[PDB]
Symmetry: C3
Subunit: 426 residues, 3 copies
């Protein structure tokens, strides 16, 4: 034909192109794509994070008695299974002799034992480890820190925001407008390490973690180190992420009491302590010292057959047992370390006078932490939906309004034209 | 009805859905959303940044006279308010005696005093602090650095691009294709610190800031530290941000002389020095030593009642006095430190010969900075408008072209159909 | 007129606005814009990277013979061009005397020489440099590392995934769930440095690079340093980038044998070694020791006129000779260093016994690397097309369906209406 032969390709080919192009805007929508948004909103009064710091030594050597070596001798790796110093050939010169009159057990008649009570008196004490800190020039106290427990032993927490005291805030950047702690890691009272184990440690420092205040401390997997004899400027940078709920991303939404069995808030580091507690109470009824709840802590004899082999199974065979993902409102904290050597020539003769110690002791034990904010900004890393439902109806309609010019009314008009087909002319 | 009863829901319900969906594409536009764009454009000849480095000690102790302790004795924290060494019990062994015959003032008849003139001769000198630097193997001079002033005292600047000399460029990554400075922090000439103040400092190092060349140095809030006895590889990474003007984001746009009262360009660190100058000249007519302009610097007696308490008020009560935000064309510089111990066994006997100093002095005072580019890239972090006006008319039209099929012509055709209503049939 | 005079502005002005708005959605498409997508997908079993570590000293001083000083004396900077120790006034006390009876050449009759054979026996040996490493507690061997060659001399590689052994994987974060190497940098056997050159080095440490396993080691431009006497916790963070092919970005797509002349895979660091090989074999037929292929390595006499001046020309005059960009599937590795001082008071008397060395030697030569993953995540930084072709036809049609209401059918209906013009009425 002349008029109708051209429309066999025109109206049908444009319809054939439309079904290819209308699908790739509907197949695109069900991917649930999302793009991000980095911003840098300045502020004037930023809150302070929660520093958590503890020594790299769990137990003070000068504060273990003849009772504690009896029950926990396999735990400290100071005795064998037969209760003896395991052939310490050329160990030391004096530190044998403190154990030579404490590892006797000659008809000892041992007292009852506790495990949390062992951590509290034989850990390092912040009344002696700390010398003088500050906060914007205003002085500290030892009562500003709080005793927390984790795998490294007794650890402390500054600005935790727990048990009544509120949270502290900075109003300036700089270096002297944050913490200036002056610790003393006490290398005289370390555990003697003349033996050898796979878990042995040679170092001597302090593990610090800077986290938000809505999390428990998670020192063993998130903390950095700070060397003695150095002043370390830990600059910070507050980041506020905003994630997306499924099917876009993966985020358990925030609520009042979401998935709380032993805590109140919800966090990633608040969840592996939850899943490593319910597994231990249900397997052999233990509870390690850092786990929350009211279940009784178990003996160090149970520590070799319930602590290590059961918590090996959460990373060996039962990695599908519990799973938990990021909350939708995080707050991270970046860090940019840099070190400056602390005991200068001018200060070697004053610090030796003030704390009554040798100049050799000062260069090997004094450690100045220094935490601040770099500039008073905070970055936001959001996740925004790339293709909403209200934008799908636009681009699916603008193609139909281009190729055939038919609206959603006229397709129903053809559907009522088939009603004119069925009985009016048939 | 049969034909018209169905259109009471068809034409009206699709219009009812349209007003919900056309609003959420107009309410979306007035949020002014924006998404970002990270790119990594390789290059071949990148410019070099502007290193700014100075000691952690403001005044050399062996270069203060009996005049300078008279006027600035409260400033250096070496005298009391009654002009005496404040009970330095067991201070030192020799460093008392330099002050025992300089803190006399027995009918001294004091000369006139200046404050910038005190900084220039009693600060640390780069002719003696610097030993030998390099740039791509080609040797330095002491005349490549420039004297600048900030809160830490006299500080120097490499590759500043000021007073005629052009900017230097790198053509390779590596470690030996940048600065290799060998400083000497001079711990023999530090200030004696047998006293105690809140502002006291024990450390001994060097504060470096790597910034762009369109900014003044802002050492006290943006600089890291470098320890003596270590060689620190400061790797860099050039970033070029592009921000957005309001109402999308917050950015004063770039111009020729934007908001310049004492500078020429515009920057964030070039603005707080501006706002801390206009406040000080209008309150008690002072000018601290690091502030630009022609107003006269004031005496250290005015330093206790105008420098510290007035600049306390900009972070206490008048945080709304001046505000200034990011320019739209920044250039940052990342950094990734790492340290290697400098005085090796092979070099302990050569450096002791060449600079005529003991092996104890070399391990406590020699410091090798090493700044380079890691790879010759630069990242761009742009901010792009998510929903322009030209895309609003598409998605607002494709919905109307879908639900009712009415264009902007036919709504005016109905508006002229009401003209046919008003007088042709009424 | 009354009806037709209004349509001179209505139908024509809306058409006039349409050509401005339809262009800025077609001019927008040909920019090929793209936005990014940061995600954080958690995992459970992440692969381990490939550590590459070597000393900062190329040649052991106690293992160069009287033959090697004859041919390579200009290379090591130990002799002059006239084969003599160049006036070493007050050099040392003993280390002259090893060279005083080795730099004789009194009728030496020199043997034939090789250059790769010189690197293999006079480099540092991992059987003596390494003391004890670990991997998740399970012990190492010296046979887990692999000899590779680069510009720093003989370097080693852990977890390379080459020559049959598979790749190792972690299942936990923490600090003791990665490498814990205990190196010994051997400062007794360093080269004597009483001379002076522009390329001279004072430091003594170890350069480590953490890279993926699809790259050759590129130590001299991508490695950080690790100081002796310190234990450095190198935390990691696996990133998986996805780039875009042109015209959006710049990326040679991944294939089986893309641009491989001496390698198998494709990478950025695998390409500059390619371009620095083809240039050297075609200019003066050399091959430096770190270049792959079968071309013969050339003498150190050729090293002064072919190694340095020809490889100066790739960064001076022929920077357009070869160019190669990022592959579309990278894998980077971030790092966050932190140091803890290693030889504690408890371990000073045990390490002195176990490895039979003085306490002075332990604090100056023992170095504990510690590499782990922080948390078992991996970040994805994708680049997504901002404006596809299927979205162009939507927003270009929704504007035409708004302003004039004309589809692509009716513009062809007017084009056939001109066929009714040409001969039916003319
Ligand atoms: C006769 C011709 C003109 C056919 C034109 C029909 C269109 C109007 C259809 C085809 C594809 C349909 C869409 C296909 C898929 C979806 C996903 C669907 O997703 C949901 O959100 C439902 C599930 C939930 O509520 O989570 C919402 C309706 C929508 C947009 C549909 C709306 C109507 C569309 C655009
Ligand atoms: C009779 C029926 C078919 C109603 C259809 C009317 C539409 C054509 C109207 C409804 C919403 C209007 C929009 C509402 C808001 C804006 C924001 C406005 O924003 C500005 O940029 C103005 C201020 C400035 O210049 O900065 C520009 C016009 C526009 C897109 C309007 C264009 C015309 C729209 C799409
Ligand atoms: C009579 C009136 C209504 C004019 C309306 C015509 C439109 C339907 C035209 C004008 C601009 C044209 C576009 C101009 C440019 C391109 C780029 C072109 O880019 C390619 O991808 C081709 C090359 C390749 O395959 O890589 C694809 C067709 C397209 C979208 C065209 C599709 C049809 C458009 C939208
Ligand atoms: C995240 O949202 C919750 C409630 O939705 C709110 O209480 C909390 O303050 C928010 N946190 C941040 C950092 O925005
Ligand atoms: C200072 O230290 C010495 C040695 O430890 C000790 O004998 C002396 O009592 C100490 N003095 C004070 C005041 O603590
Ligand atoms: C930013 O823009 C100004 C002018 O708009 C220009 O002079 C300057 O070079 C730009 N800087 C960058 C880093 O793009
Ligand atoms: C080297 O130092 C000593 C002690 O400081 C000094 O007496 C001697 O003059 C110095 N020699 C030179 C050449 O500077
Ligand atoms: C990148 O893509 C190639 C093939 O396209 C694939 O073999 C490789 O595993 C991918 N790598 C990553 C990190 O996705
Ligand atoms: C220990 O070192 C000394 C001195 O280097 C050496 O004489 C002795 O033979 C060494 N002993 C062993 C067992 O290696
Ligand atoms: Na659209």
């Amino acid at each position: 034909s002349l008029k109708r032969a051209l429309w066999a390709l025109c109206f049908l080919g444009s319809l054939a192109v439309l079904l290819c192009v209308c699908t790739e805007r509907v197949q695109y929508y069900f991917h649930y794509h999302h793009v991000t948004k980095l911003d840098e909103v300045a502020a004037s009064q930023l809150t302070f994070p929660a520093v958590t710091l503890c020594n790299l030594n769990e137990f003070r050597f000068s504060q273990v008695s003849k009772n504690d070596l009896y029950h926990a001798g396999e735990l400290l790796a100071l005795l064998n299974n037969r209760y003896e110093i395991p052939d310490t050939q050329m160990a030391d010169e004096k530190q044998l002799e403190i154990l030579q009159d404490k590892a006797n057990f000659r008809s000892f008649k041992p007292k009852p034992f506790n495990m949390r009570e062992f951590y509290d008196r034989a850990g390092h004490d912040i009344r002696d480890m700390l010398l003088s800190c500050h906060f914007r020039g205003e002085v500290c106290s030892a009562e500003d820190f709080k005793v927390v427990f984790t795998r490294y032993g007794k650890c402390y927490t500054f600005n935790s925001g727990r048990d009544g005291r509120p949270r502290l805030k900075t109003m300036k950047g700089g270096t002297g407008n944050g913490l200036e702690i002056m610790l003393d890691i006490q290398q005289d009272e370390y555990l003697p390490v003349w033996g050898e184990t796979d878990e042995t440690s040679f170092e001597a420092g302090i593990k610090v973690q800077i986290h938000s205040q809505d999390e428990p401390p998670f020192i063993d997997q998130l903390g950095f180190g700070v060397a003695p004899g150095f002043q370390t400027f830990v600059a910070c940078q507050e980041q506020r992420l905003i994630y997306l709920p499924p099917p876009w991303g993966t985020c358990k939404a925030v609520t009042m009491d979401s998935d709380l069995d032993f805590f109140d808030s919800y966090s990633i580091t608040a969840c592996r302590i939850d899943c490593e507690t319910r597994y231990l109470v249900e397997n052999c009824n233990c509870r390690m010292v850092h786990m929350p709840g009211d279940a009784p802590y178990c003996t160090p004899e149970q520590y070799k057959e319930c602590a290590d082999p059961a918590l090996d199974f959460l990373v060996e065979k039962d990695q599908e047992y519990c799973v938990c993902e990021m909350p939708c409102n995080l707050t991270r904290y970046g860090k940019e370390l840099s070190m400056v050597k602390i005991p200068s020539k001018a200060s070697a003769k004053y610090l030796a006078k003030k704390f009554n110690k040798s100049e050799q002791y000062i260069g090997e034990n004094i450690l100045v932490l220094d935490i601040f904010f770099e500039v008073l900004n905070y970055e936001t890393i959001e996740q925004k939906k790339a293709y909403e439902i209200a934008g799908l109806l636009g681009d699916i309609g603008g193609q139909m309004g281009l190729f055939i010019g038919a609206s959603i009314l006229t397709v129903l008009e053809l559907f009522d034209y088939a009603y004119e087909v069925i009985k009016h002319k048939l």
